[PDB]
Design a protein around this motif. Structure first.
Motif, PDB file in Angstrom:
ATOM      1  N   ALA A   1       0.877  -1.207   0.000  1.00 19.06           N
ATOM      2  CA  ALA A   1       0.000   0.000   0.000  1.00 19.06           C
ATOM      3  C   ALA A   1       0.897   1.235   0.000  1.00 19.06           C
ATOM      4  N   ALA A   2       1.565   1.472   1.134  1.00 19.39           N
ATOM      5  CA  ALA A   2       2.468   2.617   1.282  1.00 19.39           C
ATOM      6  C   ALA A   2       3.788   2.410   0.516  1.00 19.39           C
ATOM      7  N   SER A   3       4.319   1.194   0.572  1.00 20.90           N
ATOM      8  CA  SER A   3       5.548   0.889  -0.140  1.00 20.90           C
ATOM      9  C   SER A   3       5.239   0.759  -1.652  1.00 20.90           C
ATOM     10  N   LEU A   4       3.992   0.422  -2.009  1.00 18.85           N
ATOM     11  CA  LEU A   4       3.631   0.310  -3.426  1.00 18.85           C
ATOM     12  C   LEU A   4       3.697   1.717  -4.022  1.00 18.85           C
ATOM     13  N   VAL A   5       3.092   2.681  -3.325  1.00 21.84           N
ATOM     14  CA  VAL A   5       3.094   4.074  -3.763  1.00 21.84           C
ATOM     15  C   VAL A   5       4.534   4.615  -3.906  1.00 21.84           C
ATOM     16  N   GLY A   6       5.423   4.196  -3.012  1.00 18.99           N
ATOM     17  CA  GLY A   6       6.811   4.637  -3.092  1.00 18.99           C
ATOM     18  C   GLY A   6       7.490   3.986  -4.295  1.00 18.99           C
ATOM     19  N   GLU A   7       7.183   2.718  -4.551  1.00 19.01           N
ATOM     20  CA  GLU A   7       7.773   2.035  -5.697  1.00 19.01           C
ATOM     21  C   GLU A   7       7.295   2.727  -6.992  1.00 19.01           C
ATOM     22  N   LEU A   8       6.011   3.065  -7.069  1.00 16.44           N
ATOM     23  CA  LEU A   8       5.493   3.723  -8.267  1.00 16.44           C
ATOM     24  C   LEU A   8       6.122   5.111  -8.445  1.00 16.44           C
ATOM     25  N   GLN A   9       6.403   5.803  -7.340  1.00 14.66           N
ATOM     26  CA  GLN A   9       7.022   7.118  -7.454  1.00 14.66           C
ATOM     27  C   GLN A   9       8.450   6.974  -7.972  1.00 14.66           C
ATOM     28  N   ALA A  10       9.166   5.956  -7.501  1.00 15.97           N
ATOM     29  CA  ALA A  10      10.531   5.732  -7.979  1.00 15.97           C
ATOM     30  C   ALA A  10      10.509   5.303  -9.450  1.00 15.97           C
ATOM     31  N   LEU A  11       9.560   4.446  -9.822  1.00 18.02           N
ATOM     32  CA  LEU A  11       9.483   4.013 -11.217  1.00 18.02           C
ATOM     33  C   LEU A  11       9.219   5.220 -12.111  1.00 18.02           C
ATOM     34  N   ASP A  12       8.392   6.141 -11.648  1.00 16.92           N
ATOM     35  CA  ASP A  12       8.099   7.316 -12.435  1.00 16.92           C
ATOM     36  C   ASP A  12       9.318   8.215 -12.656  1.00 16.92           C
ATOM     37  N   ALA A  13      10.140   8.368 -11.619  1.00 12.39           N
ATOM     38  CA  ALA A  13      11.337   9.191 -11.741  1.00 12.39           C
ATOM     39  C   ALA A  13      12.315   8.514 -12.719  1.00 12.39           C
ATOM     40  N   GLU A  14      12.418   7.191 -12.649  1.00  7.68           N
ATOM     41  CA  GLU A  14      13.312   6.444 -13.532  1.00  7.68           C
ATOM     42  C   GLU A  14      12.846   6.550 -14.977  1.00  7.68           C
ATOM     43  N   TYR A  15      11.541   6.429 -15.172  1.00 10.18           N
ATOM     44  CA  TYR A  15      10.958   6.535 -16.491  1.00 10.18           C
ATOM     45  C   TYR A  15      11.178   7.935 -17.095  1.00 10.18           C
ATOM     46  N   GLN A  16      10.921   8.986 -16.321  1.00 11.02           N
ATOM     47  CA  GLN A  16      11.094  10.340 -16.855  1.00 11.02           C
ATOM     48  C   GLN A  16      12.541  10.603 -17.257  1.00 11.02           C
ATOM     49  N   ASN A  17      13.475  10.105 -16.461  1.00 11.12           N
ATOM     50  CA  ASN A  17      14.885  10.300 -16.780  1.00 11.12           C
ATOM     51  C   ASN A  17      15.240   9.504 -18.022  1.00 11.12           C
ATOM     52  N   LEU A  18      14.796   8.260 -18.078  1.00 14.36           N
ATOM     53  CA  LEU A  18      15.093   7.411 -19.229  1.00 14.36           C
ATOM     54  C   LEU A  18      14.602   8.066 -20.513  1.00 14.36           C
ATOM     55  N   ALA A  19      13.387   8.603 -20.464  1.00 14.13           N
ATOM     56  CA  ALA A  19      12.811   9.263 -21.621  1.00 14.13           C
ATOM     57  C   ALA A  19      13.661  10.463 -22.068  1.00 14.13           C
ATOM     58  N   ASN A  20      14.162  11.235 -21.109  1.00 16.22           N
ATOM     59  CA  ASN A  20      14.978  12.413 -21.432  1.00 16.22           C
ATOM     60  C   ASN A  20      16.316  12.005 -22.053  1.00 16.22           C
ATOM     61  N   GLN A  21      16.886  10.920 -21.543  1.00 16.89           N
ATOM     62  CA  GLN A  21      18.167  10.446 -22.032  1.00 16.89           C
ATOM     63  C   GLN A  21      18.013   9.829 -23.426  1.00 16.89           C
ATOM     64  N   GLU A  22      16.954   9.055 -23.645  1.00 14.37           N
ATOM     65  CA  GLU A  22      16.734   8.454 -24.964  1.00 14.37           C
ATOM     66  C   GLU A  22      16.532   9.567 -25.996  1.00 14.37           C
ATOM     67  N   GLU A  23      15.773  10.601 -25.618  1.00  9.85           N
ATOM     68  CA  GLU A  23      15.512  11.755 -26.485  1.00  9.85           C
ATOM     69  C   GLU A  23      16.807  12.533 -26.798  1.00  9.85           C
ATOM     70  N   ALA A  24      17.614  12.772 -25.772  1.00 10.21           N
ATOM     71  CA  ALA A  24      18.873  13.482 -25.942  1.00 10.21           C
ATOM     72  C   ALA A  24      19.819  12.688 -26.864  1.00 10.21           C
ATOM     73  N   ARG A  25      19.797  11.360 -26.726  1.00 16.89           N
ATOM     74  CA  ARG A  25      20.611  10.448 -27.535  1.00 16.89           C
ATOM     75  C   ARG A  25      20.184  10.589 -29.005  1.00 16.89           C
ATOM     76  N   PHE A  26      18.879  10.588 -29.231  1.00 16.79           N
ATOM     77  CA  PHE A  26      18.388  10.740 -30.590  1.00 16.79           C
ATOM     78  C   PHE A  26      18.832  12.088 -31.179  1.00 16.79           C
ATOM     79  N   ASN A  27      18.732  13.158 -30.393  1.00 15.96           N
ATOM     80  CA  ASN A  27      19.125  14.471 -30.879  1.00 15.96           C
ATOM     81  C   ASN A  27      20.619  14.498 -31.207  1.00 15.96           C
ATOM     82  N   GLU A  28      21.417  13.803 -30.405  1.00 14.41           N
ATOM     83  CA  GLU A  28      22.861  13.760 -30.628  1.00 14.41           C
ATOM     84  C   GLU A  28      23.161  13.014 -31.944  1.00 14.41           C
TER      85      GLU A  28
END
Length: 106
Positions: A1-28
């Motif tokens: 419940a509480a740890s699930l919400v924390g896991e989803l918050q961490a997954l979201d931060a990882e996903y947003q960063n991954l998306a920015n890096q994949e995008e930056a890679r494409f631009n490069e």
């Protein structure tokens, strides 16, 4: 419940960063293909002009006073043109790879 919400918050931060890096890679990769395009165009001009020069040196050699030097110049130009041809091939490979990946993503 509480740890699930924390896991989803961490997954979201990882996903947003991954998306920015994949995008930056494409631009490069795009900036690399754009550069190769410019260098390739300049190289084609040089290759054509120099190939004309080497061919003339070769054709003229037998009827020049400095036959030996015309032959040597033609031969050294031919060696350099082979190197220039490999540079242009690699430049086209960079451009080609970027068009393909650009298609796949599309």
């Amino acid at each position: 419940a509480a740890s699930l919400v924390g896991e989803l918050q961490a997954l979201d931060a990882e996903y947003q960063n991954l998306a920015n890096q994949e995008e930056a890679r494409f631009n490069e990769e795009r900036a690399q293909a754009d550069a190769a395009r410019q260098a390739l165009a300049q190289n084609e001009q040089v290759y054509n002009e120099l190939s004309q020069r080497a061919q003339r040196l070769q054709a003229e050699a037998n009827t020049r006073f400095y036959k030996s030097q015309y032959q040597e110049a033609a031969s050294k130009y031919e060696d350099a043109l082979k190197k220039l041809e490999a540079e242009m091939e690699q430049q086209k490979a960079v451009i080609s790879d970027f068009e393909k990946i650009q298609a796949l993503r599309a």
